[PDB]
Structure 1
């Protein structure tokens, strides 16, 4: 009946999931680039730049 009695394991799983999710989400960041997609910045631009 009583839930929330298993906080440790649930916390561990949530921590792993959050770390993975934010690692995946980091792909969309720009980091000061012009875009977060390689193909478009490759196509719109030229070689030496």
Structure 2
């Protein structure tokens, strides 16, 4: 049971070292807030007539 836990934690390190998209839920929050601040800046370019 100890060797299985130690081996299963080894796969957490290997996974987080290997695959880029693991934290997709958190990066998508940072992306949404940054996209909103960038859209709000670009809207200063609008003439509105």
Q: Which TM-score bucket, shorter chain as reference?
A: 0.5 to 0.7
Q: CA deviation at 1:31?
A: 0.5
TM-score by length of 1: 0.62
How many residue pairs get aligned? The number is 32
Deviations 1:12-45 (A, max 9, x none): 000000000000010010001xxxxxxxxxxxxx
Give runs of ≥4 in structure 1 deviating > 4 Å.
none
Q: Which has the higher contact order (CA 8 A, sep 6+)?
A: 1
TM-score by length of 2: 0.62
Residue 17 of structure 1 aligns to a residue whose secondary structure is: helix
Question: Rg: which structure is higher?
Answer: 2
In structure 2, list runs of 5 or more residues that go unmatched. Answer: 1-17
In structure 1, list runs of 5 or more residues that go unmatched. Answer: 33-49
Q: 1:2 and 1:18 mapped to 2: Cα distance?
A: 24
Residue 5 of structure 1 aligns to a residue whose secondary structure is: coil
